[PDB]
Design goal:
Helices cover about 25% and strands about 20% of the residues. By secondary structure, it is α+β, with helices and mostly antiparallel strands. Bound molecules: adenosine-5'-diphosphate (ADP) and magnesium ion (2 copies). One magnesium ion (MG) binds near residues 59 and 221. Its main location: nucleus.
Length: about 230
Amino acid sequence: VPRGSHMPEETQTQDQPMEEEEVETFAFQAEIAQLMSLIINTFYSNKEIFLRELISNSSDALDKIRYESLTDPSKLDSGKELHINLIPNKQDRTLTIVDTGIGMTKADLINNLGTIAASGTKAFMEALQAGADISMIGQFGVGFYSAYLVAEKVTVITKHNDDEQYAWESSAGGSFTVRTDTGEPMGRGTKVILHLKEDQTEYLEERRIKEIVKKHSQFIGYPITLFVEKER
Ligand SMILES: Nc1ncnc2c1ncn2[C@@H]1O[C@H](COP(=O)(O)OP(=O)(O)O)[C@@H](O)[C@H]1O
Ligand SMILES: [Mg+2]
Ligand SMILES: [Mg+2]
């Protein structure tokens, strides 16, 4: 019976029930798979333009918030700032691009990030064979896959007002997964987590990140902030 003091193990709360996350696996559309293999396995001198492409996608998503308010004003009542955060993590070798844009639903991840061919994909691959600069990518409707210039794996966590939170992930190799994400709620918007290749760790350094934002992304139209972890 009587106790005056308990040890931590004794008062540890019972876990919450384990949750199921549904996972689905999809092949990339053929030309997207071919483009990813070309991007991954070819040397380019201008790999830094991946960040321009990801920032442009965030800016497009943030522009959609403003305009969706013309057909659904309730979004004006959100208190979230429309912004982009860049978050390098040296410990994990990741660079994360976070925005408070519209987010993507599950079917948006499946249809917009791998299973549908952009009409320009074949033309762009021929331009690259003919020696085009990789910087031309986004003009061909396939800018997202520039992430694989620097990343060995990409994870996209996203939440749109009309669906639950999802995670898309791919290490290339011809397929990607989409799985419900019952982890840390991120609130409306998208987080693209780049797991950087070992020779691409310059993109974790604050001066390099500032250099490429100022070179290539000066008309975002929204505040961008770079979080720098304090050196211990
Ligand atoms: N940060 C993001 N927020 C919302 N949707 C995104 C984001 N990044 C990519 N997307 C979705 O992925 C699609 C493909 O992106 P991309 O390959 O850059 O082509 P594009 O920007 O020309 O449409 C976008 O059209 C958009 O629907
Ligand atoms: Mg784009
Ligand atoms: Mg703009």
